[PDB]
From a paper:
For another cryo-EM map at 3.2 Å resolution, the densities of a sulfate ion and ATP were observed in ABclosed and ABsemi, respectively. However, there was no density at the catalytic site of ABopen, where the first ATP likely binds as the first step of the reaction. The structure containing ATP at the ABsemi is termed Vsemi1ATP. Therefore, ATP at the catalytic site of ABsemi is most likely derived from ATP bound to ABopen. This indicates that Vsemi1ATP is in the state after 120° rotation of the axis, following only one ATP binding to the catalytic site on ABopen of V2SO4. In other words, Vsemi1ATP is the state following 120° rotation of the rotor in V1ATP (lower to middle). In contrast, the density for ATP binding to ABsemi in Vsemi1ATP had to be lowered to 1.5σ for visualization. The low contour threshold of ATP binding to the ABsemi of Vsemi1ATP is associated with a high B factor, which implies greater flexibility and/or heterogeneity within the nucleotide. These results imply multiple ligand conformations of the nucleotide binding to the catalytic site on ABsemi of Vsemi1ATP in the initial reaction process.
Vacuolar/archaeal-type ATPase (V/A-ATPase) is a rotary ATPase that shares a common rotary catalytic mechanism with FoF1 ATP synthase. The thermophilic bacterium Thermus thermophilus (Tth) possesses V/A-ATPase, which functions as an ATP synthase in vivo. In the V/A-ATPase, the V1 domain (A3B3D1F1) can function as an ATP-driven rotary motor and ATP binding, ATP hydrolysis, and ADP/Pi release that occur simultaneously at three catalytic sites of A3B3, respectively. This cooperative reaction produces conformational changes in the A3B3 stator, which induces a 120° rotation of the central DF rotor.
Numbering used by the authors:
A (entry chain B), B (entry chain C): 194 to 386
C (entry chain A): 1 to 578
D (entry chain F): 2 to 472
E (entry chain D): 5 to 474
F (entry chain G): 169 to 209
The structure:
Amino acid sequence: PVQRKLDPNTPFLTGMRILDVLFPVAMGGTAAIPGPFGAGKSVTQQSLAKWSNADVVVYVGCGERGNEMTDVLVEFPELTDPKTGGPLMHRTVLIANTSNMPVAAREASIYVGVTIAEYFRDQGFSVALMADSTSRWAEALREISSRLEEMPAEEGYPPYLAARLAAFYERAGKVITLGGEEGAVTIVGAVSP
Amino acid sequence: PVQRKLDPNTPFLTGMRILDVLFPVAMGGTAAIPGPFGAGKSVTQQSLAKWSNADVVVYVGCGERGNEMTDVLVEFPELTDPKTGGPLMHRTVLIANTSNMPVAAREASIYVGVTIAEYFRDQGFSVALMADSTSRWAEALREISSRLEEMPAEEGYPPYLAARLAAFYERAGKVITLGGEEGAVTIVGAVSP
Amino acid sequence: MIQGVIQKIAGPAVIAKGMLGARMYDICKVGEEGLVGEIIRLDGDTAFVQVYEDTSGLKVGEPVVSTGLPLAVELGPGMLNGIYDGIQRPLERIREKTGIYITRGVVVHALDREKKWAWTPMVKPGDEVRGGMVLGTVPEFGFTHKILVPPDVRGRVKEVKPAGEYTVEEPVVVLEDGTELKMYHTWPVRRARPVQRKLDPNTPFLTGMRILDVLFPVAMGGTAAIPGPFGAGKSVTQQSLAKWSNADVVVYVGCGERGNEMTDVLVEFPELTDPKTGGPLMHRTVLIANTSNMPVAAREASIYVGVTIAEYFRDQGFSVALMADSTSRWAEALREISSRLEEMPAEEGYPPYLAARLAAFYERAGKVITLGGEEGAVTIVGAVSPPGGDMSEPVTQSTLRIVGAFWRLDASLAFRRHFPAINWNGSYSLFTSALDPWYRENVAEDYPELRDAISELLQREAGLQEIVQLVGPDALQDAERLVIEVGRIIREDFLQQNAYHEVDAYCSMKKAYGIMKMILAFYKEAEAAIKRGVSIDEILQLPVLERIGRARYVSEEEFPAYFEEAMKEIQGAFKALA
Amino acid sequence: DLLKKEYTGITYISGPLLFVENAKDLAYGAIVDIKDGTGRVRGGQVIEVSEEYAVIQVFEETTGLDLATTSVSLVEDVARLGVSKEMLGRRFNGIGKPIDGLPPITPEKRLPITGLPLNPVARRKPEQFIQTGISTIDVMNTLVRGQKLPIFSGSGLPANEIAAQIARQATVRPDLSGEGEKEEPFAVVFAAMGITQRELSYFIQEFERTGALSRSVLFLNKADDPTIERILTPRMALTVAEYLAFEHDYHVLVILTDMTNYCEALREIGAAREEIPGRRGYPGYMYTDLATIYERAGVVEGKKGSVTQIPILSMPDDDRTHPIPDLTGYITEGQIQLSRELHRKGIYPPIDPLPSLSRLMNNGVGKGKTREDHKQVSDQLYSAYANGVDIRKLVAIIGEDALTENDRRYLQFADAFERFFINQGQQNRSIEESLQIAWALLSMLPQGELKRISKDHIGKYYGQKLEEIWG
Amino acid sequence: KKEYTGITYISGPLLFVENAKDLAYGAIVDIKDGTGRVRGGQVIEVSEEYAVIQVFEETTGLDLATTSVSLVEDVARLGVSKEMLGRRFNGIGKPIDGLPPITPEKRLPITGLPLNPVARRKPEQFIQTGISTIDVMNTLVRGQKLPIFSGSGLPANEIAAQIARQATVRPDLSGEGEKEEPFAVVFAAMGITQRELSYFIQEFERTGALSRSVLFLNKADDPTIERILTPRMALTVAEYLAFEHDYHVLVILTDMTNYCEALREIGAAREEIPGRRGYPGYMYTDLATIYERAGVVEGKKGSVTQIPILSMPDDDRTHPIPDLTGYITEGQIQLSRELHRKGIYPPIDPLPSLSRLMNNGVGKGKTREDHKQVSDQLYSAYANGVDIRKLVAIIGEDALTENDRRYLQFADAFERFFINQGQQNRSIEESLQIAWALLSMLPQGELKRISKDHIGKYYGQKLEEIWGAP
Amino acid sequence: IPGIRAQIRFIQQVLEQREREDTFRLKRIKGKIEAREAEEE
Ligand SMILES: Nc1ncnc2c1ncn2[C@@H]1O[C@H](COP(=O)(O)OP(=O)(O)OP(=O)(O)O)[C@@H](O)[C@H]1O
Ligand SMILES: [Mg+2]
């Protein structure tokens, strides 16, 4: 619960000229970053984590490949926070997964991450959530739906895919916490068709 | 019942150049007028109703807009019958089952219209039946079949749709009525693929 | 002897109750008429029986008795030149017994019992004998027919009848234990006949058609599939293989295909001549005919009976060819039976075990060291009939993964009356490499090189068609147009073949090698000429293209001289250009 | 048989089905009479029997039935029809009840409508040559007596007209074949399924005009008639045809008017029974069911009769991959496929030579049957027309001016072909005139490009120009 | 010991047993018929009322009066030991080479336990497969999953056997290096015809490759459940060796399309509603559990690689099997029909191929410092050459520039001397030498991608070095 | 190119529709089979 949702009146400075100037994302906003191969998505996301104004950064890997997840896990610890000069891992939370892990875990990864971000928001911080590979999460959802023998829609995805995507992307937004402070959650969800 | 079916050998002058010239339909024949939305099904059907040379015209709004029936009501009384001189409404019988009215009533509307046309045929007149949309009749059949838990054939329609359409259309034809007089019925059924 | 009573009749299926003790896949007699049927499911004390005959007119309460044995075929002398129904019932005897119509319940033995055969014993009293050894010999239409000890029999021979005339029922040999080995022996159709070893294919199965025998060969132990939409010429191709193949025995299995094809075979083959033996061609063939309107459940039985007969003749030492006329109809029969069983379909209604059944059927092919020590083989050439030409049907895709050769027919070629109508791009063959040593020793020392050159030319032509479809066939340069024209020559003068001609119907490997030599030499000289400035518009007008085109029709004996003349003419024609 | 057995205790009526509880005695495939309170009697056939109940498919609509007063009684353990020599010149409904107003026929025998398969050994090679009078059929898609040649129609093409023309003009040619001269005409068995009054009136008028009603049998199942009756009409018609042909030495020509309606009825029954559908919702056994109808044609050894078939079939979306055309093509022997493009241009009969086919042609054309040059002429015409159509497709992308002289010649040949060979109105071309026109057209191409034909025939027939025949 | 004789239903591949509460789900059972023959089976559903058993092979002799079901093992396991090297197995573990059965060191569950993401580490060393088009342009690094997409008729089996015979590690190139680093190749063939089995056995036994490889060969006519189990048994052995004896194991899965078809058949047998395009809904997770058992773990010197081989059904890249394999794996080596028909072997097309981990297994101390640039330059030059070759069929050779003619010659020389290496085994240095010789045909200064230092150091050799001695 | 793209989309939609109908029929027959099994096993 939140006391009241506010309008997007302030920006989420990502620290990169193109994004901060030509395509700004408001604090409490939502953005999508399709990731092809060789486009340096990992570097862009690490830059967002390092330099953005968000106090705490939550990274969610829904169903990433094994070795991509290994790279992710072995690259954050070496990152250096530019503000305090210490390790960046002292202000981030990593939710890791791989394709061979149980389907329920992959399906619930994004919800776990967003709930943690909401907690850190209620405290009075500004949280940046980066749900990588929401397409893999959609795959987990499809597998779960087929396990229950639901009727598919479109390319085999369950008819309620948009409902869940909205339920996840609408928890973002800057709000006045129940305690009267001000906090925000900004979601940057990748898409990998 | 009827004595003998005859061979259609006179035209059902529709008052439209293209139809009456390039693609004629005989007095006892049948015609279908498929067309996507915004093509002219409604205006074409109303033109057929207004100007055709049928002695009596039966219009069956089997699941279409109510404004169409209202337009017929509010305009036809003012117009003049080409052949009798009286108000145009005195030779038309409407059977209005708008879209938002009960679904199952569309089948009944089609059958009632064709039966009334058959009656006025038996009296010696030449009738013209304008079925506003048989796709809505097909939808009614599909819904009832779904409730019965029958097996759909294609696109969900019941397997016996072809027989029903055949029975409905075969009632058209020029005839020596049981009283000895000559009569006919013309069916111009619209389809909305 | 289990007995029960019918409880439910639904099409070709019958559910019998009181059959507690029956075994899966055992032949049961249904009703008073004793219609044959096979158990395919057991529920409580009920057995689900599929009837190999029309069940119209049956009633509930009629008796059902199980024989306790699975479907079996009588293997022995008397099968060649015959024609059989799905479950090995002679059709000439049915024709004599009933009228011109097949009728239910006829009981007729597979092998004649009243005919006497000349027996010449090979074994001697008191000698060892093992499964698959040759007891004796019996003449049959110029073949030498070997009587084999059943695959699972052992002992020492007590007494053997002296050479003389006997019937198949005579116990020619008696073992010590007391068992009597007659001139035949039953064998379950669903069990592969045991063998000693499987050999790698190293010989070609000369089908007699240039395209199949050159670009897409099939080995002596190979398996090939010939899919194609209706009208593409599957039946003509398979009949050509039956007529001209080099196999010693040809088993033709009409699994649910047009009835008139079997009549064509019966009426034609007795008049043609066997390529090798020289006697009538019908003396080397066995027909297992199950037309489309014959009972559906019998299609699987027909396929299995055919393959088992082929395996028997292999065990005798011959090399056999098995032409399955349509396996898609076998799949359809399985689908109808599954529907009657109310199972869970996969894909387009086919039961899940279809792929396993097809793999089991195909894996019986191969060259083998029979149990007797001799060497035999079985080649399976099974057609496929996808609906609407779809090569994505489950049947065709399941066949792609177990067949070593693939001969994909095309509708576009068939429309132009261009036969055999093999889509060159889609077909393939995996026996090409393993057969090279044979070609280098029995066709020509460089045959593989010419085959590869022709394939490369066709591939280049296919690559250039991508451009021709874009910028017209006249915007190309000279070399590319020459490639296109040589591709046309290859299509129209080498691959094409009129199966109804008196000479072109058959084409030995020497003839194909000669034509390939001619085309390649022409292409080499033409390319040289184009380099030096000649115009293609005049290369296509040379008077040697006519001879290259007519090279197909020259007889098999005149070909060497004609080929020498053609090569000289090629050299002369392209030398005169200066 | 003499006594009458009745089964009350119906427990279910939905669509075309009907369940009887204690019908253990009823036999699979039996025919039953359903009687309602008003006293009307309908027909039905058992399609499943068990100790608990028995399924009956009602031929006529189920209106008026009830679970209280309705009763089911047996008629015959196996469906039968009372064939007889006297039924020529009579009209019957889909079940066999006369509609011509004449009394019922005194049967000579009762035969099972389902029939029995013809023994492959007892079959005979179909050899004789039928001169359909249409050049596209006689020359390129020859029809031989004892053949199954469906006419793949379209939504609004004139398939019925072509069938009537073939029935009217079809005559065998003993003189060419060297057989004893005789003029025994064809007997027609006309099985109808869901025919609209228009087509039925057309067929009746054509038969009356040609005088074929004196020697034809009609099985009419009009569109307004019950749908499930269609499952029986083909079988009864073919039973009559086989009886006449193989017990009286008749040359019977069977015309089935719309196999698509038959497939619709079969789909209705199958879906009502929960069958595992194949493609497009049709039942999985449609292939076998259609085979049992088509494959009842052919020729038998030692009998002078012959049964020919021309099933007219309307491809739904002018689509050749629809399940009905696919199965019919896999069962029948070739097909004569009409095309819409030719029809719009005004060609009649709009037979498309390229997709058509005839698998029994080679048995009926050749030396001593029609003429020495038949097969080669047909093959060369196929090749030339195919090249013409390919060049016609090329033009629409590369422009007329770009063509060479050879391409222009082939294109002109294709046009002249479509306008002089296919298009023939209602005239009755003999085989000789058709071959003459074929050679006249082939003369347009250079002599060196007729690769399929042998040089002897080229020398003998090449040269005569089309202008001589017309203009 | 205990036999459940209460059979009450047999149909197709299933049979039911009453009073079978004691049996555990997923257990393996032995079904004994009247004649004494024994068939296998696996429980697929256990209930208070009855237990459903899926039978291996067939049910041709069973009946409800004599059939008896007895337990064999609670959960499927495989005996594993170092001695497996040099043996062959049928997919269930029973030997088929005629040698005595192995005496297991320990018995491990076949179904794999997921690796902990925090216990993995980046792939950073390369495997020299001996095929230039893979070792140079699409390197294969230890811990990578690099499927080989093929077609219906292309020679996937020959390439698989070649990689099995030639694959080796190169410890010397890594710094000071080590004298030895044990290497093994686990071969898992699923649904392969008898001909393919004879070919594989002969190829492995002909050159002593069998002395360090384990073969799990499954015939096409063998039961489908064995096909499902084969990859899992092979990967169990691979994991055992790699992570308990410090081996560098390479796993080749011969046909994943056959595995997917068997999975579909099994899913249909158990009454499961199919998902997309008729395949099981959970195919993604199953293929993940097979693929993602490879990697490199921290604190262990071993490694597991995979080279799945899948034949795209109809050359469709969007078919579910290739698509999911693409999602779960890194890269693909795509064979081409055009190159094959042209006579090139192996017919690997560098243009659509990709290796996503190449940049990590290449550089100083691993291969040579010019590897990455050489690969990039070869890719660009080949693409340009093939485009120019298409153009020449329209515009004619004379109307090209000089450099376009150079590219046109380079494309042909590349196709003939780089890809078409036949059966010869090429070390990484030889492949790089041939690459530099081919690039030398292009005019220096048009090698934009390469730095000046490398161009100076290596440019200039003659293609005749390999032509005169292939 | 847009024409071919439109045709591709149309064919994809048709095939997806057919697959969806097949799954629906499979689901209903599975329901009937489950009902029968529960009633009588
Ligand atoms: N014959 C006509 N002359 C002039 N205007 C016409 C004619 N036919 C149609 N129109 C115009 O086009 C509009 C669409 O025609 P109409 O209402 O008959 O559509 P329709 O085919 O029945 O479609 P829908 O089902 O979407 O209503 C008409 O409202 C009128 O504006
Ligand atoms: Mg409208």
